[PDB]
Design a protein that fits this description.
39% helix, homodimer, 11% strand, His_PPase_superfam (chain B), isomerase (chain B), globular, Rossmann fold, 6 strands, binds the ligand O=C1c2ccccc2C(=O)c2c1cc(NS(=O)(=O)c1ccc(Cl)cc1)c(O)c2O, binds chloride ion, EC 5.4.2.11 (chain B), alpha/beta, bisphosphoglycerate mutase activity (chain B), phosphoprotein (chain B)
């Protein structure tokens, strides 16, 4: 009867969550920060305790985790960060709003990318304003040329998140360690897809709420014994 | 030089203000303490410091100081390792008492002696102490053996349990070329400084490390400083 909690960060600065923020290291907006505080407050009111926390290397998820740990008085917990829990890399679309994306690539192609599980957007090229900012960021300096994405389909995102789940998170859960994961929509999709054994179509329709603790009760085989629960009013 | 090490004592706590002995009590930063840590971080940012790994205690005044620094230098993504071994000295029965209550109960003479002694501990925190359960039964210490969980510490005891972490967990990282940041407490950092500079018991007790100011060491490959520590800031 292992217990697992996931939280998806809230709003990021400059409307970036509506602009394919992806691997660009946008901070939380004050509103996104307040959401995290409400979620942490919900975990406290419910008396939740953790033994270890996992997050991405992106500050919007990390600050979400910090806000939560602060709210529940568990700032002393071990924290593990990994690029593998990063948001999906949206390639050349990173930073563009809906109108700019449509104008640049056309409604037909945008619809195809939106509904596809395995078609990536175009690569982020050297002329992209974020190209050097992301690709040469020191935090990814140890990644092999294979590992560092120029773009990702949802399938690619899920493919690189799962090995971390299996090799680092699973063992902790099986040891009775109470895990908290603070990450992004698409990396959490990968975990939820594997947990509940959803299909590609189903995972693409799943939209995890932000700033709300997501609770899983898992059996001995790390299979959910009930549907995901949310904490709050 | 071969290596660079940065140390920082946590910013002023809410109890530093009230002049109460915190020790292992988990007092938070005061608003001023938070501003100190932020200034420290800005100094590190202005000088272009980059780190590869951070160490801190399990006390929030040090952790929050580290968080504030990492935020200021845009390195929130760094791996962070927390250990009770970098905790502040455990002040035993003095925990929670202020200056007046301490002199009232123990006399100025005894206080003088504790103050100037390297190896004499204050009285033990016993079960009837009002902070006994709050500290002694905190689950963050659940994995400590019976003899690791102190009821009180001399400065010698503190340094004695800090240095093993330094030698076993931090030294190898430094020699691996990792640029280390340690955000901790006056007395746990004293142990590190004493070992780096091979200082005498009296010299280390005269060393006052200021809250929230980054301290830089330039080290040779054997981790010997090539010059005096430098304070970073305005
Ligand atoms: O009583 C102690 C003391 C007691 C036992 C071990 C170490 C110390 C110690 O190191 C110390 C003390 C007092 C003061 N000055 S004091 O204004 O009386 C004081 C008191 C308590 C606190 Cl929290 C702060 C200041 C100092 O400057 C010290 O370095
Ligand atoms: Cl952290």
């Amino acid at each position: 009867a292992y217990k697992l909690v996931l939280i998806r960060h809230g709003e990021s600065a400059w409307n970036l969550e509506n602009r394919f923020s992806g691997w660009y290291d946008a901070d939380l907006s004050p509103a996104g920060h307040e959401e995290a505080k409400r979620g942490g407050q919900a975990l406290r009111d419910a008396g939740y305790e953790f033994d270890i926390c996992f997050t991405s290397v992106q500050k919007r998820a990390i600050r979400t985790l910090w806000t939560v740990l602060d709210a529940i008085d568990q700032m002393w917990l071990p924290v593990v960060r990994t690029w593998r829990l990063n948001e999906r890399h949206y390639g050349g679309l990173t930073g563009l709003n809906k109108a700019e994306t449509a104008a640049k690539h056309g409604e037909a192609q945008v619809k195809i990318w939106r509904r596809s599980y395995d078609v990536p957007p175009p690569p982020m090229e050297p002329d992209h304003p974020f190209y050097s900012n992301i690709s040469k960021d020191r935090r990814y300096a140890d990644l092999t040329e294979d590992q560092l994405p120029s773009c990702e389909s949802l399938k690619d995102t899920i493919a690189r998140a799962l090995p971390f789940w299996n090799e680092e998170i699973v063992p902790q859960i099986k040891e009775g360690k109470r895990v908290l994961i603070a990450a992004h929509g698409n990396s959490l999709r990968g975990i939820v897809k594997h947990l509940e054994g959803l299909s590609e179509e189903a995972i693409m329709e799943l939209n995890l709420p932000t700033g709300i603790p997501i609770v899983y009760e898992l059996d001995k085989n790390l299979k959910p014994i009930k549907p995901m629960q949310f904490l709050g009013d």
